[PDB]
Amino acid sequence: QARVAVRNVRRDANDKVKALLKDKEISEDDDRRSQDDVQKLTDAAIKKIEAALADKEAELM
Amino acid sequence: PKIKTVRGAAKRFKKTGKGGFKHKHANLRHILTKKATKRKRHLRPKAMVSKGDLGLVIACLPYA
Amino acid sequence: GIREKIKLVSSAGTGHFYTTTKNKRTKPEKLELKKFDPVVRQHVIYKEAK
Amino acid sequence: TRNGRDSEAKRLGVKRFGGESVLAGSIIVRQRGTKFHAGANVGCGRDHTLFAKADGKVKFEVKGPKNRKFISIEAE
RNA sequence: AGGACCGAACCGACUAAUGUUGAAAAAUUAGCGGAUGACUUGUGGCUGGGGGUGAAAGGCCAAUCAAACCGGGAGAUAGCU
RNA sequence: GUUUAUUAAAAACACAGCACUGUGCAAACACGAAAGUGGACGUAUACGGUGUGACGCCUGCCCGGUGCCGGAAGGUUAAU
RNA sequence: AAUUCCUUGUCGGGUAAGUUCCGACCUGCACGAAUGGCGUAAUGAUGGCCAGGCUGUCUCCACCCGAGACUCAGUGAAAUUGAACUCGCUGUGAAGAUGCAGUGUACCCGCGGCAAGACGGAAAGACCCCGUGAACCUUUACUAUAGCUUGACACUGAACA
RNA sequence: CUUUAAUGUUUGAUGUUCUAACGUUGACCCGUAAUCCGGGUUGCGGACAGUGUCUGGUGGGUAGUUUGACUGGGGCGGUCUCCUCCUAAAGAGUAACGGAGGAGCACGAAGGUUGGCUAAUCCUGGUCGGACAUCAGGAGGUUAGUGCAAUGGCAUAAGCCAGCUUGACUGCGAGCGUGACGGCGCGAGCAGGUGCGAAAGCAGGUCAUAGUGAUCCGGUGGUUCUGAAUGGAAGGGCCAUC
Ligand SMILES: [Mg+2]
Ligand SMILES: [Mg+2]
Ligand SMILES: [Mg+2]
Ligand SMILES: [Mg+2]
Ligand SMILES: [Mg+2]
Ligand SMILES: [Mg+2]
Ligand SMILES: [Mg+2]
Ligand SMILES: [Mg+2]
Ligand SMILES: [Mg+2]
Ligand SMILES: [Mg+2]
Ligand SMILES: [Mg+2]
Ligand SMILES: [Mg+2]
Ligand SMILES: [Mg+2]
Ligand SMILES: [Mg+2]
Ligand SMILES: [Mg+2]
Ligand SMILES: [Mg+2]
Ligand SMILES: [Mg+2]
Ligand SMILES: [Mg+2]
Ligand SMILES: [Mg+2]
Ligand SMILES: [Mg+2]
Ligand SMILES: [Mg+2]
Ligand SMILES: [Mg+2]
Ligand SMILES: [Mg+2]
Ligand SMILES: [Mg+2]
Ligand SMILES: [Mg+2]
Ligand SMILES: [Mg+2]
Ligand SMILES: [Mg+2]
Ligand SMILES: [Mg+2]
Ligand SMILES: [Mg+2]
Ligand SMILES: [Mg+2]
Ligand SMILES: [Mg+2]
Ligand SMILES: [Mg+2]
Ligand SMILES: [Mg+2]
Ligand SMILES: [Mg+2]
Ligand SMILES: [Mg+2]
């Protein structure tokens, strides 16, 4: 459920940017680039989430 | 075939005694109010094609 | 932009005129000035000024 | 903030260094303010261009209680 | 009875190997689909190049085609090699 | 069933079926400067165009934009 | 999902183990109702997955029969090619060296084999950019134009409301 | 005039009747043993339909073309002319998709002159009143101000206020700056005529450097310069202007 929340943020994020493409306020370059930071952010938030999960999984097992 | 004259340069330089050409000064055709009287007054007389341009004017006016 | 062009035109015989601009918006009162009419070759009044 | 504009250089400064003989009329200095001031036989024009009112040699001085440069033209 | 079923001739061309200065400018070999049908085939006819024809692929129109071939304008033009 | 003769046989094209639409016959429509001809020696249970694609259950909301079908008091508007 | 970017989403199933598959969830980046939606018996040289049988596909290759390859005789090509007395290294260098420097090594010449190099052969790169290049194709690009459509006048007349 | 109504005059349109142009891809007759065509007879339409010329709309159905360039490949973004400063190496000039900002105006006074005046900032006092509203004094001394970016100037002020005024002037211009050039700028002085000043004198816009647009094509005013036989005229030129 958590990764899912994280990801939903991936989704608005790209949405915002995606949208700053028309209204040419961003170079197609700009755009790729950023969407990548968002990926970086998302992977990171997740790996955290999985550290946590693992911490606990240790307990339960 | 007779070289044909650049019919339009002939309408803008007139050949002069010693050999140069005289022409009218540009910049005196409109947008006039905004220009100085000194300025305009000096663009009234005619003028001699420059050392650098004869080349081109003679080129155009082979029968001048 | 905004500032209209106008002629001021010899009050003497001649059709000769000087040329200038005014702020029509805030100054609608026909401009008017002694200027030199080089035709009559004297200094006459010069009127008109939209 | 988006740079990369400049204006064309107005070709300023001294045109005739001290001692140069000039003809009445010539331009001894171009300048925006009166970096130099007109002295004797030197007119200052309406852009502060200083010129010669007289043929002579160019003379630079610092005169004045304010210690200002002046350009004059001595007859030669 | 049937754009029905298996299967030669016939018509196709799905896969593989060979071949690739080939036996061949598209094939051979083993397998493959159709096989009374919108089937297939001989002879002749008709449709012509911004035109034809096309169960549509921009396919086909004489070993080719996002505009055939031949002759002409013609030594087009080539700030390129 | 068709298709890229010669790298694609397919999920693409076609299909029966469905719908919209045009067409009253010297039909629409198409080949034609035209005459002519096809449509058809047919006649709306016919014929062209377009989309969808057996059959079953079905096919909701929006007509502002853009088409088209109508109306029309007004505004502007061609030759003359 | 022939649609899902994150994505091998999560759960379930199948497996020793399954990024595929099947069944589920809804978080549908970006399904959806004749540009049809969801189903569907049959059909399919159609796409994905599974299993039995099968096996040289494989562990891992062995032997064998045939056509070549090899030798003799006859005939007799090809692409290519500035010229060659045509080695390895390490360096240098228009920057990846048979050819330069240094050095190592090598008696002269075939034959059968193998393809690591000769940036090997073939086609004046198809990608890329350039040219005020070409050509098709699109459209509420520009400009024209066949078609269709509006009116006036002409062929075109007489009465009337 | 409003608004209205009505006979009439003008001009349009709309409808109905007719038949004789015109249509007939109804019928029958002859050429003619012929599905063509022609002529004829008849019926049906009928000045409509249709066609020519002119005209408005529609018109990727078709056609010719256009669709910039810089760029640390191209594209995307950004940029394109002008002005100030730095880079720029103490004359000039000097590049980058180098670092910073501004212009596409404003003003008949914000111009000319003659006379006159002089800021900021802080301290101290005292109405509201504050760190800064006005006033006093002192300090200070141009940090202020300059219509606007930045640089250079400015006290003799170029800063600020008044009076009179139109030099924001017409012809020219020795001489010089700066540009490949087109051009741009500076200029004493000369003639005419002016404004201020008792007068020496100052004034051809504005402290200066941005505030811009070649040529062609026309438009407007002026000048007999030209005027296609001649006199005029159109048109053209010249000067001012859009
Ligand atoms: Mg003129
Ligand atoms: Mg059968
Ligand atoms: Mg095939
Ligand atoms: Mg076979
Ligand atoms: Mg069979
Ligand atoms: Mg045949
Ligand atoms: Mg295609
Ligand atoms: Mg062919
Ligand atoms: Mg062509
Ligand atoms: Mg030719
Ligand atoms: Mg040639
Ligand atoms: Mg089939
Ligand atoms: Mg093929
Ligand atoms: Mg139909
Ligand atoms: Mg379909
Ligand atoms: Mg599934
Ligand atoms: Mg619907
Ligand atoms: Mg479907
Ligand atoms: Mg031999
Ligand atoms: Mg080596
Ligand atoms: Mg090497
Ligand atoms: Mg060998
Ligand atoms: Mg080999
Ligand atoms: Mg090669
Ligand atoms: Mg090449
Ligand atoms: Mg090429
Ligand atoms: Mg076109
Ligand atoms: Mg470019
Ligand atoms: Mg310097
Ligand atoms: Mg230097
Ligand atoms: Mg001032
Ligand atoms: Mg004074
Ligand atoms: Mg105080
Ligand atoms: Mg005449
Ligand atoms: Mg005459």
PDB file of C-alpha atoms (C1' of nucleotides) in Angstrom, chain F residues 4-53:
ATOM      1  C1'   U F   4       2.810  -6.610 -49.774  1.00  0.00           C
ATOM      2  C1'   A F   5       5.224 -10.697 -57.840  1.00  0.00           C
ATOM      3  C1'   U F   6      10.973 -10.413 -55.222  1.00  0.00           C
ATOM      4  C1'   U F   7      12.605 -10.063 -46.608  1.00  0.00           C
ATOM      5  C1'   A F   8       5.720  -8.826 -43.705  1.00  0.00           C
ATOM      6  C1'   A F   9      -0.041 -14.046 -45.070  1.00  0.00           C
ATOM      7  C1'   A F  10      -1.034 -11.269 -40.213  1.00  0.00           C
ATOM      8  C1'   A F  11      -4.361  -9.312 -35.428  1.00  0.00           C
ATOM      9  C1'   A F  12      -4.202  -6.035 -41.765  1.00  0.00           C
ATOM     10  C1'   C F  13      -8.230  -6.133 -46.581  1.00  0.00           C
ATOM     11  C1'   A F  14     -12.764  -8.542 -47.779  1.00  0.00           C
ATOM     12  C1'   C F  15     -17.049 -10.715 -45.982  1.00  0.00           C
ATOM     13  C1'   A F  16     -22.374 -11.856 -44.880  1.00  0.00           C
ATOM     14  C1'   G F  17     -24.959  -8.749 -41.296  1.00  0.00           C
ATOM     15  C1'   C F  18     -25.852  -3.660 -39.156  1.00  0.00           C
ATOM     16  C1'   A F  19     -26.473   1.764 -39.412  1.00  0.00           C
ATOM     17  C1'   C F  20     -26.165   6.731 -41.256  1.00  0.00           C
ATOM     18  C1'   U F  21     -26.881   9.357 -45.688  1.00  0.00           C
ATOM     19  C1'   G F  22     -27.936  10.731 -50.768  1.00  0.00           C
ATOM     20  C1'   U F  23     -30.869   9.591 -54.887  1.00  0.00           C
ATOM     21  C1'   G F  24     -38.459  10.421 -58.118  1.00  0.00           C
ATOM     22  C1'   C F  25     -35.380   8.600 -62.939  1.00  0.00           C
ATOM     23  C1'   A F  26     -33.091  12.612 -68.646  1.00  0.00           C
ATOM     24  C1'   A F  27     -32.006   9.699 -60.396  1.00  0.00           C
ATOM     25  C1'   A F  28     -27.809  10.573 -57.316  1.00  0.00           C
ATOM     26  C1'   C F  29     -23.027   9.367 -58.793  1.00  0.00           C
ATOM     27  C1'   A F  30     -18.899   8.480 -62.192  1.00  0.00           C
ATOM     28  C1'   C F  31     -15.766   8.811 -67.509  1.00  0.00           C
ATOM     29  C1'   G F  32     -16.369  12.931 -70.645  1.00  0.00           C
ATOM     30  C1'   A F  33     -14.574  20.846 -72.490  1.00  0.00           C
ATOM     31  C1'   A F  34     -18.917  17.995 -75.431  1.00  0.00           C
ATOM     32  C1'   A F  35     -21.751  14.641 -78.027  1.00  0.00           C
ATOM     33  C1'   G F  36     -22.174  10.562 -75.712  1.00  0.00           C
ATOM     34  C1'   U F  37     -21.685   6.346 -72.136  1.00  0.00           C
ATOM     35  C1'   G F  38     -21.797   3.696 -67.426  1.00  0.00           C
ATOM     36  C1'   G F  39     -25.563   3.744 -63.118  1.00  0.00           C
ATOM     37  C1'   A F  40     -29.685   0.204 -65.812  1.00  0.00           C
ATOM     38  C1'   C F  41     -32.414  -1.724 -70.745  1.00  0.00           C
ATOM     39  C1'   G F  42     -32.575  -0.893 -63.537  1.00  0.00           C
ATOM     40  C1'   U F  43     -36.990   2.534 -60.778  1.00  0.00           C
ATOM     41  C1'   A F  44     -36.713   3.534 -53.490  1.00  0.00           C
ATOM     42  C1'   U F  45     -37.783  -4.397 -51.471  1.00  0.00           C
ATOM     43  C1'   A F  46     -33.718   0.122 -56.575  1.00  0.00           C
ATOM     44  C1'   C F  47     -29.128   2.520 -56.934  1.00  0.00           C
ATOM     45  C1'   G F  48     -24.487   5.442 -55.090  1.00  0.00           C
ATOM     46  C1'   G F  49     -21.462   7.174 -50.748  1.00  0.00           C
ATOM     47  C1'   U F  50     -19.643   6.376 -45.822  1.00  0.00           C
ATOM     48  C1'   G F  51     -18.541   3.876 -41.176  1.00  0.00           C
ATOM     49  C1'   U F  52     -19.076  -0.946 -38.460  1.00  0.00           C
ATOM     50  C1'   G F  53     -18.100  -6.144 -39.373  1.00  0.00           C
TER      51        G F  53
END
